[PDB]
């Protein structure tokens, strides 16, 4: 209910915990002379001091430090040599864990997946769960801040995970990623290419739908390629993600709930850098303005949207502060229920330039019903207004779907709402220029106010009347048709 | 019954409070770099620590600080640029708020007005709240000490507004400024020119006709031209209001 905006800027500058009983284990001798000799972490070292059990209350197992889940502790190896596994970690409650493990390949995936959670105390603590491994290689799933038990027992409150390899964070096809309700991560290696199911928010227990269930997958130390595979953001809840990347973010199948947010934030121009008593400072940031070689080649916009009916849509959205907001050859879907399903494509301080077509319930044409009024909506530098919205491919519109443009210079190539009607083709936010290529129109509700549209073709509603091209504002004075051809 | 000149000369020079869990927040990049966006207070900014609620016993709103209302926040702009709003502040009991925005417009008004009351409590707090804006345009209604719940509940204690802008505070039509049985407020702009309801002292609850409901608007630091529009002094009581102004 808060907003992202709020909730990654008050937890970006926490105190970590105050844990008594501090354990330090030291890797010795034996682990630094074999460099293939495949160990583990859990059986090999970190069962000395971390306890399973049984939670009283619908759990399956149960894993704290030691007495509690109020101890840190710190596996500091900085020479061992090989490669190693977690392999089964499932439902860790602890606490302040760093495993750092210099020159040593990690995998977190064999046979079993993982889990980091905390537990929601009077104490509102964190886990802050670091590791500082050589490579990664998740290879399998992997929750953050799941469900402990089972609906019941503790509840969850927030957490952290951090990984900082030094030469690559890979993945599989089967590990899907899925960070909840209150969990972040942050990543640190060079070239991170994430080939799994990521998946931000997520239904933490088994019918709140009306659970905020922010996330961040903060990838800012990132100096190399960040190539995400397969997000999915939202799960039967209005959950709200966020991503602060690197000025890089080429990414793959994006799948948006109905009422999910996405908040990519590119780096700034330079990078990044009986008693009173007094709170330390908590600095926030407003949305600021992208560096100038920003670039976000989100290539295929899908959404999931089924459920029940409200009294208006649900409005998906993604916020983009890059420079550039490319979407490549995929083109953006929308699937469409009864009511009228509509994703926000919004850029605040860049540009837009989509070159795939527009689809709705997957295929090119997409006629909807006329409570379904499926509405794209593009924003192309919004606190700037020098932002171009260009889409150099030739869309289609079926019936009952509407395009909207609101930026300083609407370049296209072709519209057909010929085929369908009832199109609301507003443009009521550009500010001086709208290049369109091709138009057909049937019934239209283009609202331009300057353009120069080359060629126009007029078609017919068939034999029924009320129907027709209609032009709903102020036409100018530098407006232009260099060619009116009616059918 | 003791009079305003007791009154205003015993709350003149006061200790503000004694606040445990001094907030302090700061806006950083972003706010700096957008001169005409339109931002918000509440939303953008001051919902992060400041909660809503629910008083029990006959109330519609309930905002107060962090765990109570004996904790004093700040927040630290002094360069953030733009135009702002507060828009729907409604029964903030809260206590020691001080908006430090320099080169920064306000705006006290948009689609609702706001409010600003103290808790009758045993400590006998006030609430000290400041504004340090460029300009201000109150801009709709605001009411100051009000009633928190309706009549039952926690009664209202005193308050202190200060609004010290650097360019000037002017006001819309319908924005009835209505300061009321213990609130006092302070101006330090050039220019002040209210062109709204002032109502100094009203009835603070439903019936009672025999409140002392004293007041004070001291115009002291306006270095300009004061010109109120419309004043109203008294609302079916014995209100004994007061203003120090600053020789025009």
Known sequence: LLGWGLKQAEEANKTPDKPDKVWRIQAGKGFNEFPNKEYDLYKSLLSSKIDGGWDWGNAAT??????????????????????????????????????????????????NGNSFTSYKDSADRTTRVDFNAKNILIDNFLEI???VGSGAGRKASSTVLTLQASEGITSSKNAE?????????????????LNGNVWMGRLQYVGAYLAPSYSTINTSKVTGEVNFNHLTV?????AQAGIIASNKTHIGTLDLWQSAGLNII????????????????????????????????????????????????????LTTNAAHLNIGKGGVNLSNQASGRTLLVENLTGNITVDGPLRVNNQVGGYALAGSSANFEFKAGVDTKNGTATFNNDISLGRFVNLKVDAHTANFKGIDTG?????????????????????????????????????????????????????????????????????
């Open 62 to 111: 149960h894993y704290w430090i030691k007495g509690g889940q109020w101890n840190k502790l710190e596996v500091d190896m900085k020479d061992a040599v090989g490669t190693y596994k977690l392999s089964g970690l499932r439902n860790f409650t602890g606490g302040d864990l760093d495993v750092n493990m210099q020159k040593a390949t990690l995998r977190l995936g064999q046979f």
């Open 145 to 147: 801040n799941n469900r």
């Open 177 to 193: 990623i899925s960070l909840y309700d209150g969990a972040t991560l942050n990543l640190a290696s060079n070239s991170v290419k």
């Open 234 to 238: 939202g799960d039967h809840n209005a």
């Open 266 to 317: 590119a780096p700034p121009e330079g990078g990044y850098k009986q008693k009173t008593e007094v709170q330390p400072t908590q600095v926030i940031d407003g949305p600021f303005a992208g560096g100038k070689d920003t670039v976000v080649n989100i290539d295929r916009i899908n959404t999931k949207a089924d459920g029940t009916i409200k009294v208006g849509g649900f409005k998906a959205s």
């Open 419 to 487: 085929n369908g009607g009832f199109n609301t083709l507003d443009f009521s936010g550009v500010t001086n220029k709208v290049n369109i290529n091709k138009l057909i129109t049937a019934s239209t509700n283009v609202a331009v106010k300057n353009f120069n549209i080359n060629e126009l073709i007029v078609k017919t509603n068939g034999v029924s009347v009320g129907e027709y091209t209609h032009f709903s504002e102020d036409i100018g004075s530098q407006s232009r048709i260099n060619t009116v051809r009616l059918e």
